[PDB]
């Protein structure tokens, strides 16, 4: 757990620093320097929107790959003695890959909402552009993380179903239902993302 | 210079591919096709008076392509001679 | 007018409502499914009944979706900071309550499914416990609604 | 360079219709008549759909190609 | 299951049998696969040059087929490729066709008819001068002025898009629409084949509940999308570009009932009413499948004559309806894989060309003619290592996957046994 | 004449009250859940009797919900920074007290249901201990109310 | 006049006095309940006598509650920043001292109940240790009061 | 006009596209390699057949390289913040997609090489999975081509 120790140390140090910094800012009457408005406003909307698109695609692909290998290891381990699995259980893999597809689609649906400003002053950038950036980032986060969790869940269920299939053929048909449920979450994320960027308009 | 027939087959197929595709590329360059404009090694000065300089550069690249086609013809001949040897 | 950055917290509220509820539902479904698949080899006739926990986990996702939709429909580029904070709170509440309920449903469903594989009489008991976990997510939804509509 | 949308559409529609409609009746009778007819009809349908999509995507453009100034300068002289 | 396979159809029969041998006397996907698998591969592997190479390789395998059949070896990969020599031949031919349609040949167009885009009208009718050319790095072109756009290119994509930096902007839309259109049409054909299955097996219950709800749902929801795509292609032009709606937003609004009073206008008069009617029919198709068939089965097999278990029948029908309804959406989404793989192949070929043989072509001195030798070999081997073999394999397997899942799920059951004679 | 971001903290009260409590409850409903399953194989007749821990864990969630709803009904656009801090304090108090009570209830309930399968007399003992754990959450609620109704 | 952020530290003092004391009491109760469940398998008659740890853990929570309520009663709109610091210090002192005391009570009570199953004479000794592990919380309470009532 | 730091993000995108993809490929080329070394002791004839995973891992790297080059050739001195962050998004997309696809390819190939050693029929099966994993990276690349040329 050496790497876990490093991560825990970094996390604890960062958050102890944050606690002490917040205490110092609040107590020394220097709260006006902790402009969260300035951070959210000066930071370009392009950063938020492009991070949103990149996450929408990359986290979806990460979940798809996670599920694909989680279920493919089990498929190819079980198929050594029951090769029929390789034929029937590809559906599990399909579901995992489906996740990634949603990703790209949402990426497109988000990438179509981008447009330059020709402005730098926050009053000039405006509520419309700032909300467009924030909502593209939020939709990217929603789709990417929902797809990540859905892909991992479908992969776990598919590995379970492949291990069950290796011992009784008549079980996969009844375990796929779980995968279907596990797939729905992905769709939900997409829907929410589509609702978040429905009225988004940069320019 | 005897060699394995597999290598001779690969050499002759590559020679045929090179000859055909590089002859076609030379013909298309010599026709001054705009699709290949990005491959022409022109400079800023070439945009001074007219397109004749770019035409000359197209012809030069076509000559390079034909030279490559001839070299691949020689390579294919060598491979065919080796095949006849085997 | 209102601040330029006001919509940020509402956006994050919707994102949290969906993301954390999806995390909870995904964990519940994964744990329940990996318990159900492993049971089925021993007790193949129980799968359908044992699908009940998965459904419960799925419901958690729905809750998130519901609240997310609300926050994604009541969120304009010029909402007051107060409404944006309300939507952020509703989203965090529903998302993290759904996360906790999904973890509880996964654990309880896996354990109860295996026990039912070993003890049919446990089935009803499992359902009760699952409901007690499922209600947790419902609680979050309630609070989320109260915050998002206000 | 006026590419009228009458000769292409008429020519390709009639060609692929003759291949996909008239072709089956000219296939000699034999064990493979059914599979050959299916091949004819499917090729006609798929190829005609692909060509129709390709041509319609270009009909009524909502924006023109973005050409570097070097290639614009060359194309002015070269192309019609 | 016995199919009386032939030498040519053996490859495709083995291809369609890999996912499960068809039941006794059900609609065989082999005859339709024989064409739609090479075609769905060519849509992804669309390239005139790579298609030519594949066709020549497959023709070599076919002509020398007897020799290799006699001279048997243990190479699994070569044996697999050889067994699909006819599959590869058809894939190469269809890839040649699509590469002609894409106007692509080793990442380069052809221009055999002449481009429809003339730059001179920009100088004549437009405001352009040599000053504007000097001042603008990339500029652009507009068809609004009269003589710039002289109609659509008669056959395939216009060559100018190869040299236009706006290439991807147009090609992404064109290929996304093409992928969705082909996918929806393939799925509709599958559903019609399912109707044929039901008619032959004498299952009117499936025909009236099942196939008909399925086709109504698919056509109303997604066939309408193809109609919208074609209509927008035919209707909106450069002059009406400003207010041209986005069919993505319109489809989303149709699903959400979010027809707004602001933003892009309606594609046609009465869009609200027609789209509401289509959506209502689509939702009603769900109860049509779910509630009806279980009730009729229960009525005619447990009230008449008096094991039937209503709860499990209802659950099974609910699972089937959920599967089909989510499958329509997820399959129309998955068919974008065609555009994804086509764009990836095109971009990989473009970068390979511009990174390998642009070195040998972009040399002033005549000595470059020697360099083009070595460079070209690398190009050649790369075009045979990354594009022909690996990208070709990926496109092949993804056309396979589209046939197994997206297409055959509509009508194929695959719960039979291969007929293994003595 | 108050900051427009004052409500933020108050919201983070409500949210927290419903989130942390839920998490705590979940843990309870999780651990006890597993315990019941583990002990249901050999002693089925104790499944319903051994559902007390889950119920207690459920009550913890309710505590949070109550406070959350209370806070969610005390929020206003012009909420002063003082009242917002009061609501944040109440939310944290109830949420984390319920979290600790849920941890204690989960551990005690798992141990007690496992032991009662072997020692019937332990049942009452378990209940007593569970009550004590429950009381912890109650304390939080009390403080929360005192903070949330000033 | 006075800073508006002083009430934040006052409510943090109250919520810390409650939360950390509740966490300590929860840990003590959980460890003691695990020990009691383990012990009672062979020695049922000691299920009640072995509940003293839990009680001694519960007392810790009460300490926190006391301080919390005190702070929740001393809070007002215009507490000087110094008064808010006093309340925060009192809350932290009581909460964390109670947390340490709860850890000690849990460990000592678990060990003592496990040992008393094998050696009755340990009981009295155990009690003493628990007292020595409980006065710690008392000490915190004292300091908190000295800070809270100043 | 534009900030002098606008070119940073795009550059990082390019580097990211090369780095993470390479890492992905590396992991694949490692895991599959290990598997081959484990397989080849008993079934040497399958080395060439079983080298497919590595090749696919290599393909992933190529995708990254492509995007990297596509971004490294488009970085101009006056690169606006819009183009800079478009290239950053493309780089993140391709890099992380290639990383995940390389991990999946490595694990699946390491399993499938050994499986094909045991059961020859699994060979094609392994491939049928690997391509799926591979296209995940491709999907990232696709989005990159959509972004860096928006
Ligand atoms: C160990 C793992 C590796 C590290 C990973 C984590 C990295 C964490 C990142 C740290 C960045 C923190 C932001 C710094 C800016 C804010 C500083 C601040 O609040 O003070 C300035 C603020 C504002 O200052 P000001 O605005 O009056 O100053 C004028 C403005 N400048 C200086 C820019 C011209 O308040 C003060 O003035 C406080 C002065 C005292 C300094 C107190 C700093 C707080 C932390 C001190 C202890 C360290 C904490 C960690 C404990 C040990 C580890 C657990
Ligand atoms: C157990 C841990 C050990 C405790 C110490 C931890 C490390 C903290 C030290 C970090 C280095 C900072 C040293 C001071 C640097 C100079 C700063 C400066 O100029 O100050 C101006 C700041 C800010 O400016 P100002 O307030 O002086 O100016 C007036 C500003 N107006 C008008 C707005 C009010 O104030 C000071 O004068 C601060 C002096 C003392 C700062 C001491 C460090 C702060 C952090 C202490 C730890 C906090 C937790 C305490 C409890 C811990 C218990 C476990
Ligand atoms: C570890 C998990 C997370 C929780 C701990 C860390 C939370 C915060 C981490 C992010 C960095 C720091 C954020 C705060 C920045 C300071 C903002 C500021 O100055 O404005 C304050 C604002 C405004 O300050 P102001 O000076 O503008 O005052 C208002 C004046 N008028 C109205 C005239 C404008 O008010 C507050 O005090 C809000 C409370 C938040 C600030 C305090 C942060 C608390 C940090 C944790 C320690 C809590 C103390 C008790 C410890 C025991 C806990 C149980
Ligand atoms: C110069 C190069 C030009 C490019 C040429 C290469 C193009 C790239 C794409 C080629 C893919 C080839 C695979 C399809 C052909 C096999 C299908 C067929 O008809 O056989 C049925 C095969 C094998 O034939 P079979 O033995 O089952 O035949 C039936 C026999 N009975 C009835 C007795 C059982 O059957 C199946 O298992 C069906 C599923 C096949 C799915 C294909 C999986 C992918 C295979 C990858 C091949 C290797 C990669 C290429 C390596 C090249 C380097 C050497
Ligand atoms: C806990 C006390 C307080 C600590 C406070 C200070 C901050 C934390 C610093 C670490 C303190 C604990 C000591 C840990 C040392 C590093 C981790 C273990 C050793 C190590 O790194 O070696 C291996 C990784 O290789 C490597 O060397 C790779 C590591 C380097 C990677 C750098 C990239 C990360 C940069 C940070 C940003 C990311 C943030 C993510 C949250 C892991 O060893 P093993 O576990 O395999 O073998 C078991 C034994 N080692
Ligand atoms: C016990 C644990 C601790 C709990 C306590 C809460 C801790 C939260 C941490 C965040 C910091 C504390 C929140 C209050 C301080 C906010 C900053 C105030 C400083 C200030 O005056 O800035 C104003 C702008 O900030 C604003 O108005 C910003 C409003 C938004 C503040 C809150 C945002 C925090 C981040 C939340 C992220 C959530 C993510 C969820 C996934 C001025 O602006 P002006 O208009 O006067 O400008 C005039 C320019 N000429
Ligand atoms: C919007 C675009 C999509 C449109 C797609 C649908 C429209 C095209 C298909 C419509 C139906 C065509 C006719 C069906 C067959 C009728 C039977 C007579 C046909 C005929 O003359 O040939 C018989 C052999 O046909 C046979 O053996 C079977 C021929 C089957 C033809 C249809 C197959 C292609 C459909 C797939 C299209 C491509 C995919 C689209 C994405 C000779 O009679 P015989 O003596 O052989 O007796 C029969 C068995 N032996
Ligand atoms: C480049 C642009 C065009 C691209 C798109 C079109 C591509 C068409 C691809 C199909 C053409 C190749 C067909 C295979 C040639 C080899 C023949 C193999 C053996 C053979 O005769 O196969 C028979 C099956 O029918 C057959 O072999 C079928 C032959 C007749 C097919 C008719 C349909 C062709 C496509 C539509 C018309 C052309 C459109 C383009 C102008 C039955 O095997 P056997 O009895 O000989 O076996 C002897 C052992 N039992
Ligand atoms: C096995 C295959 C299964 C089927 C697969 C196909 C998918 C079927 C989808 C559902 C049924 C067909 C589509 C119905 C939705 C409406 C279609 C509108 C098409 C469209 O854009 O046409 C414009 C509207 O037409 C008008 O202005 C006229 C009034 C509005 C349309 C009325 C309904 C037309 C369709 C009739 C039913 C066809 C059924 C096909 C199966 C042309 O109008 P514009 O541009 O000139 O005017 C505009 C200024 N005013
Ligand atoms: C191993 C097996 C063998 C493999 C064989 C592979 C063969 C590949 C050979 C070609 C590769 C290079 C492709 C480049 C294609 C561009 C050439 C091109 O554009 O052609 C046309 C140009 O000449 C004319 O066009 P223009 O002058 O711009 O316009 C004038 C056109 N009007 C007159 C019709 C209006
Ligand atoms: O040309 P352009 O590319 O510039 O834009 P356009 O608008 O003019 O043309 C676009 C034409 C077509 C719409 C382009 C096809 C592109 C697609 C990205 C998505 C296809 C996926 C589908 C239909 C199913 C999955 C869901 C998608 C949004 C979610 C819908 C489902 C629910 C809300 C439940
Ligand atoms: C059984 C249902 C109602 C849910 C279980 C929890 C119930 C009992 C809780 C949840 C929220 C709670 C309410 C929260 C806030 C207030 C405002 C207060 O001034 C009067 C009590 C009242 C109105 C509470 C009554 C009890 C309550 C309704
Ligand atoms: C054993 C019983 C009494 C405790 C269980 C119910 C608890 C939550 C209730 C019962 C009576 C309640 C008190 C009654 C009235 C008030 C006055 C108000 O301004 C602050 C809260 C305060 C001080 C309440 C705190 C919470 C309280 C103690
Ligand atoms: C479980 C029980 C028996 C243990 C003791 C808890 C009760 C009695 C404690 C906890 C909080 C305490 C309160 C804390 C603060 C105040 C305000 C102070 O100015 C006078 C007394 C008063 C009102 C206290 C009375 C006693 C009190 C209510
Ligand atoms: C100037 O430019 C506009 C916009 O492109 C064009 O429509 C118009 O005809 C031009 N007018 C001239 C050259 O007088």
């Amino acid at each position: 757990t050496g790497l876990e120790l490093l991560y825990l140390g970094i996390f604890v140090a960062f958050w102890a620093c944050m606690i002490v910094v917040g205490i110092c800012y609040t107590i020394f009457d220097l709260g006006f320097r902790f402009d969260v408005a300035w951070f959210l406003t000066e930071t370009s909307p392009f950063m938020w929107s492009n991070l949103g698109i990149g996450l929408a695609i990359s986290l979806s692909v990460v979940g798809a790959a996670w599920g694909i290998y989680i279920t493919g290891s089990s498929i190819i381990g079980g198929g050594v003695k029951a090769p029929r699995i390789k034929t029937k259980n590809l559906v599990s893999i399909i579901f995992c890959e489906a996740v990634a597809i949603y990703g790209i689609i949402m990426a497109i649906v988000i990438s179509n909402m981008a447009e330059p400003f020709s402005a730098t002053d926050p009053k000039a950038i405006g509520h419309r552009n700032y909300h467009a950036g924030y909502s593209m980032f939020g939709a990217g986060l929603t789709v990417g993380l929902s797809n990540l969790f859905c892909g991992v869940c479908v992969g776990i269920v598919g590995s379970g179903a492949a291990l069950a299939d290796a011992q009784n053929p008549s079980l996969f048909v009844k375990i796929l239902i779980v995968e279907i449920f596990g797939s729905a979450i992905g769709l939900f994320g997409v829907i929410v993302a589509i609702l978040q960027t429905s009225r988004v308009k940069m320019g | 210079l005897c060699c394995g027939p597999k290598l001779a087959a690969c050499g002759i197929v590559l020679s045929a591919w090179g000859v055909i595709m590089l002859i076609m590329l030379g013909i298309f360059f010599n026709v001054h096709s705009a699709v290949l404009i990005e491959d022409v090694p022109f400079t800023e000065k070439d945009f001074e008076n007219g397109p004749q300089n770019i035409y000359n550069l197209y012809e030069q690249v076509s000559y390079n392509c034909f030279i490559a086609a001839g070299l691949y013809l020689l390579l294919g001949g060598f491979s065919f001679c080796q095949v006849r040897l085997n | 007018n209102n601040p330029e950055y006001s919509s940020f917290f509402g956006v994050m509220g919707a994102s949290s409502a969906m993301v954390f509820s999806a995390m909870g539902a995904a964990y519940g479904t994964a744990k329940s499914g990996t318990g159900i698949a492993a049971m089925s080899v021993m007790r193949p006739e129980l799968i359908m009944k044992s699908i009940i926990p998965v459904v419960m986990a799925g419901i958690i996702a729905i809750y998130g979706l519901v609240v997310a939709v609300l926050i994604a429909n009541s969120l304009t580029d010029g909402i007051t900071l107060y409404r944006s904070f309300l939507q952020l709170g509703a989203g965090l509440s529903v998302g993290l309550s759904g996360l906790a309920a999904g973890f509880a449903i996964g654990i309880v469903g896996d354990a109860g499914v295996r026990g039912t594989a070993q003890q049919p009489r446990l089935f009803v008991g499992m359902i009760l416990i699952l409901i007690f976990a499922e209600v947790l997510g419902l609680y979050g939804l309630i609070v989320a609604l109260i915050l998002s509509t206000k | 360079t006026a590419h009228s949308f009458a000769l292409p559409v008429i020519i390709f529609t009639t060609f692929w219709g003759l291949i996909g409609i008239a072709g089956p009746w000219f296939v000699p009778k034999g064990p493979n008549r059914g599979v050959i007819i299916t091949m004819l009809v499917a090729t006609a349908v798929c190829c005609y759909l692909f060509w129709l999509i390709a041509i319609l995507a270009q009909l009524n453009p909502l924006f023109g190609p973005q050409l570097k100034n070097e290639t614009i300068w060359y194309v002015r002289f070269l192309w019609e | 299951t016995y199919n009386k396979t032939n030498k040519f159809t053996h490859g495709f029969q083995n291809i369609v049998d890999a996912y499960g041998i068809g039941t006794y006397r059900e609609i065989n996907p082999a005859p339709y696969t024989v064409i739609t698998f090479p075609f769905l591969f060519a849509v992804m592997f669309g390239d005139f040059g790579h298609g030519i190479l594949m066709t020549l390789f497959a023709v070599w395998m076919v002509l020398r087929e007897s020799r290799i059949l006699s001279q048997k070896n243990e190479n699994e990969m070569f044996s697999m490729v050889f067994s699909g020599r006819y599959i590869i031949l058809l894939m190469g031919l269809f890839s040649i066709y699509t590469g002609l349609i894409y106007n692509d040949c080793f990442s380069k167009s052809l221009n055999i008819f002449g481009s429809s885009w003339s730059v001179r009208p920009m100088f004549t009718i437009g405001n352009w001068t040599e000053e504007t050319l000097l001042g603008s790095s990339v500029l652009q072109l507009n068809p609004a002025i009269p003589g710039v756009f002289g109609g659509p290119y008669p056959f395939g994509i216009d060559p100018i898009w190869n040299i236009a930096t706006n290439k991807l902007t147009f090609l992404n839309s064109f290929k996304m629409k093409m992928s969705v259109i082909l996918g929806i049409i393939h799925m509709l054909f599958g559903v019609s084949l399912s109707l044929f299955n039901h008619i032959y097996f004498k299952k009117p219950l499936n025909i009236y509940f099942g196939f008909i709800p399925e086709i109504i749902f698919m056509s109303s929801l997604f066939g309408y999308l193809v109609i919208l795509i074609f209509y927008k292609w035919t209707a909106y032009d450069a002059h009406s570009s400003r207010n041209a709606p986005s069919l993505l937003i319109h489809f989303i609004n149709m699903f959400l009932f979010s027809y707004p009073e602001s933003g892009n206008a309606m594609l046609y008069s009465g869009q609200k009413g027609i789209q509401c009617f289509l959506i209502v029919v689509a939702m009603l198709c769900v109860p049509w499948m779910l509630l009806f068939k279980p009730l009729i089965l229960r009525h005619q097999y447990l009230r008449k004559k008096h094991v039937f278990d209503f709860g499990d029948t209802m659950v099974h029908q609910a699972i089937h309806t959920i599967e089909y309804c989510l499958g329509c959406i997820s399959n129309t989404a998955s068919y974008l894989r065609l555009w994804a793989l086509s764009l990836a192949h095109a971009q990989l070929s473009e970068v390979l060309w511009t990174m390998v043989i642009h070195i040998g072509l972009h040399v002033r001195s005549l000595a470059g003619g020697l360099g083009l030798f070595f460079i070209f070999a690398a190009f050649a081997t790369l075009t045979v290592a990354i594009l022909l073999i690996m990208e070709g394999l990926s496109a092949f397997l993804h056309a396979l996957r589209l046939h197994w899942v997206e297409f055959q799920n509509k009508f194929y059951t695959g719960t039979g046994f291969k007929f293994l004679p003595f």
Side-chain angles (χ1 to χ4, degrees), chain A residues 36-45:
Chain A
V36 182
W38 167 89
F39 166 71
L40 300 172
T41 281
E42 301 293 312
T43 281
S44 198

PDB file of all heavy atoms in Angstrom, chain A residues 36-45:
ATOM      1  N   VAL A  36     -14.480  33.537  -4.881  1.00  0.00           N
ATOM      2  CA  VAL A  36     -14.884  32.423  -5.729  1.00  0.00           C
ATOM      3  C   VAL A  36     -15.511  32.949  -7.011  1.00  0.00           C
ATOM      4  O   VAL A  36     -15.421  32.311  -8.068  1.00  0.00           O
ATOM      5  CB  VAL A  36     -15.842  31.485  -4.976  1.00  0.00           C
ATOM      6  CG1 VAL A  36     -16.214  30.305  -5.848  1.00  0.00           C
ATOM      7  CG2 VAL A  36     -15.207  31.012  -3.681  1.00  0.00           C
ATOM      8  N   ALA A  37     -16.154  34.114  -6.943  1.00  0.00           N
ATOM      9  CA  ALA A  37     -16.678  34.748  -8.147  1.00  0.00           C
ATOM     10  C   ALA A  37     -15.565  35.015  -9.146  1.00  0.00           C
ATOM     11  O   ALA A  37     -15.701  34.729 -10.338  1.00  0.00           O
ATOM     12  CB  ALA A  37     -17.381  36.052  -7.780  1.00  0.00           C
ATOM     13  N   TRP A  38     -14.452  35.572  -8.674  1.00  0.00           N
ATOM     14  CA  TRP A  38     -13.334  35.868  -9.559  1.00  0.00           C
ATOM     15  C   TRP A  38     -12.800  34.599 -10.204  1.00  0.00           C
ATOM     16  O   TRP A  38     -12.497  34.582 -11.401  1.00  0.00           O
ATOM     17  CB  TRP A  38     -12.241  36.588  -8.770  1.00  0.00           C
ATOM     18  CG  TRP A  38     -10.921  36.702  -9.443  1.00  0.00           C
ATOM     19  CD1 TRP A  38     -10.508  37.700 -10.270  1.00  0.00           C
ATOM     20  CD2 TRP A  38      -9.817  35.804  -9.313  1.00  0.00           C
ATOM     21  NE1 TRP A  38      -9.217  37.471 -10.678  1.00  0.00           N
ATOM     22  CE2 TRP A  38      -8.772  36.310 -10.103  1.00  0.00           C
ATOM     23  CE3 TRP A  38      -9.613  34.614  -8.610  1.00  0.00           C
ATOM     24  CZ2 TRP A  38      -7.545  35.671 -10.211  1.00  0.00           C
ATOM     25  CZ3 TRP A  38      -8.396  33.982  -8.720  1.00  0.00           C
ATOM     26  CH2 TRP A  38      -7.378  34.509  -9.513  1.00  0.00           C
ATOM     27  N   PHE A  39     -12.692  33.517  -9.431  1.00  0.00           N
ATOM     28  CA  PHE A  39     -12.230  32.255  -9.996  1.00  0.00           C
ATOM     29  C   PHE A  39     -13.181  31.761 -11.078  1.00  0.00           C
ATOM     30  O   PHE A  39     -12.763  31.469 -12.203  1.00  0.00           O
ATOM     31  CB  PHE A  39     -12.090  31.210  -8.894  1.00  0.00           C
ATOM     32  CG  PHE A  39     -11.944  29.811  -9.409  1.00  0.00           C
ATOM     33  CD1 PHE A  39     -10.782  29.408 -10.033  1.00  0.00           C
ATOM     34  CD2 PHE A  39     -12.974  28.899  -9.275  1.00  0.00           C
ATOM     35  CE1 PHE A  39     -10.649  28.123 -10.511  1.00  0.00           C
ATOM     36  CE2 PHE A  39     -12.843  27.615  -9.751  1.00  0.00           C
ATOM     37  CZ  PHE A  39     -11.680  27.229 -10.368  1.00  0.00           C
ATOM     38  N   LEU A  40     -14.474  31.670 -10.760  1.00  0.00           N
ATOM     39  CA  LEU A  40     -15.431  31.131 -11.720  1.00  0.00           C
ATOM     40  C   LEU A  40     -15.609  32.033 -12.931  1.00  0.00           C
ATOM     41  O   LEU A  40     -16.057  31.558 -13.979  1.00  0.00           O
ATOM     42  CB  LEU A  40     -16.787  30.911 -11.054  1.00  0.00           C
ATOM     43  CG  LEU A  40     -16.822  29.940  -9.880  1.00  0.00           C
ATOM     44  CD1 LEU A  40     -18.179  29.987  -9.212  1.00  0.00           C
ATOM     45  CD2 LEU A  40     -16.500  28.537 -10.344  1.00  0.00           C
ATOM     46  N   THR A  41     -15.273  33.313 -12.816  1.00  0.00           N
ATOM     47  CA  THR A  41     -15.554  34.274 -13.872  1.00  0.00           C
ATOM     48  C   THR A  41     -14.350  34.503 -14.780  1.00  0.00           C
ATOM     49  O   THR A  41     -14.474  34.425 -16.005  1.00  0.00           O
ATOM     50  CB  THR A  41     -16.015  35.588 -13.236  1.00  0.00           C
ATOM     51  OG1 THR A  41     -17.392  35.480 -12.858  1.00  0.00           O
ATOM     52  CG2 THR A  41     -15.848  36.732 -14.187  1.00  0.00           C
ATOM     53  N   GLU A  42     -13.182  34.792 -14.203  1.00  0.00           N
ATOM     54  CA  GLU A  42     -11.994  34.996 -15.023  1.00  0.00           C
ATOM     55  C   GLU A  42     -11.621  33.727 -15.775  1.00  0.00           C
ATOM     56  O   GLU A  42     -11.227  33.783 -16.946  1.00  0.00           O
ATOM     57  CB  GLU A  42     -10.829  35.463 -14.155  1.00  0.00           C
ATOM     58  CG  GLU A  42     -11.099  36.756 -13.416  1.00  0.00           C
ATOM     59  CD  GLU A  42     -11.228  37.943 -14.341  1.00  0.00           C
ATOM     60  OE1 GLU A  42     -10.360  38.108 -15.221  1.00  0.00           O
ATOM     61  OE2 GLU A  42     -12.197  38.715 -14.188  1.00  0.00           O
ATOM     62  N   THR A  43     -11.726  32.575 -15.118  1.00  0.00           N
ATOM     63  CA  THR A  43     -11.479  31.306 -15.787  1.00  0.00           C
ATOM     64  C   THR A  43     -12.345  31.209 -17.038  1.00  0.00           C
ATOM     65  O   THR A  43     -13.564  31.382 -16.976  1.00  0.00           O
ATOM     66  CB  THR A  43     -11.778  30.151 -14.828  1.00  0.00           C
ATOM     67  OG1 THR A  43     -10.679  29.982 -13.925  1.00  0.00           O
ATOM     68  CG2 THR A  43     -11.994  28.857 -15.578  1.00  0.00           C
ATOM     69  N   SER A  44     -11.709  30.928 -18.169  1.00  0.00           N
ATOM     70  CA  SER A  44     -12.403  31.014 -19.445  1.00  0.00           C
ATOM     71  C   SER A  44     -13.487  29.942 -19.540  1.00  0.00           C
ATOM     72  O   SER A  44     -13.268  28.802 -19.127  1.00  0.00           O
ATOM     73  CB  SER A  44     -11.419  30.852 -20.600  1.00  0.00           C
ATOM     74  OG  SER A  44     -11.973  31.342 -21.807  1.00  0.00           O
ATOM     75  N   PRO A  45     -14.663  30.272 -20.086  1.00  0.00           N
ATOM     76  CA  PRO A  45     -15.670  29.225 -20.315  1.00  0.00           C
ATOM     77  C   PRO A  45     -15.175  28.119 -21.220  1.00  0.00           C
ATOM     78  O   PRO A  45     -15.682  26.992 -21.155  1.00  0.00           O
ATOM     79  CB  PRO A  45     -16.835  29.991 -20.954  1.00  0.00           C
ATOM     80  CG  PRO A  45     -16.650  31.390 -20.539  1.00  0.00           C
ATOM     81  CD  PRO A  45     -15.182  31.612 -20.407  1.00  0.00           C
TER      82      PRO A  45
END
